[PDB]
């Protein structure tokens, strides 16, 4: 497994000590657990040894990988300057997206200040979007923006619903509060307010 450029010349016990001491940031020692594993290491034993449970180890590895896939592409350094203390659980839900739409989803999820549930559902609006090729008003929501994918989900879930009843309208108002294009906005305005 690949090791960072700093710890290239340590042994297994050096890895163990830097893990048990937290003597780095998470994206600096998450690759290390992976290399350490190859030299005889088990996570249940590591709970006795370092002291991080297996679910946390997996979350850390996947989060560091997602963060690398983000930083290696077009971006601005503010969000990587924000993913420094406690960004693993949020990076763990966008792992479903390919590298292109990943950097687009990160902006949405950190600007609206969303938690794991919203991130899981949002990546899903994006993953479900492509296989609805034929629908009512599908090409009016663009694909390269996450807000419009989520807005399309909400709109279709309220589209053939009960006559208003403040249920269809409520989902329409949810859809209008997240869309970020202009065709989406004037279409949802055509729908919710006046033919």
């Amino acid at each position: 497994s690949p090791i960072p450029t700093q710890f290239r010349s340590l042994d297994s016990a050096g890895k163990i000590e830097i893990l048990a001491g937290r003597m780095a940031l998470w994206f600096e020692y998450a690759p290390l657990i992976s290399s350490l594993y190859t030299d005889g290491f088990t996570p249940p034993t590591i709970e006795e040894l370092t002291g991080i449970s297996s679910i946390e180890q997996n979350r850390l590895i996947v989060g560091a990988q997602v963060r690398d896939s983000i930083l290696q592409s077009i971006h601005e350094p503010e969000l990587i300057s924000a993913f420094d203390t406690g960004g693993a659980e949020l990076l763990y839900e966008i792992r479903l997206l390919s590298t292109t739409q990943r950097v687009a989803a990160a902006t949405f999820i950190i600007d609206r200040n969303i938690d794991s549930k919203g991130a899981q559902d949002l990546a899903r609006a994006i993953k479900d979007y492509p296989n609805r090729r034929g629908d009512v008003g599908w090409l009016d929501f663009d694909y390269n923006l996450p807000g419009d994918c989520l807005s399309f989900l909400y709109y279709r879930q309220s589209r053939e619903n009960k006559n208003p009843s403040d249920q269809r309208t409520s989902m329409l108002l949810q859809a209008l509060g997240v869309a970020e294009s202009e065709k989406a906005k004037n279409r949802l305005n055509t729908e919710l307010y006046g033919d």
Binding site: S1, S34, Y37, T38, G40, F41, T42, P43, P44
Partner: peptide, 9 residues
């Protein structure tokens, strides 16, 4: 098998 999978094998 479990230990090996944990090692990443």
């Amino acid at each position: 098998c479990v230990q090996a999978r944990n090692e990443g094998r």
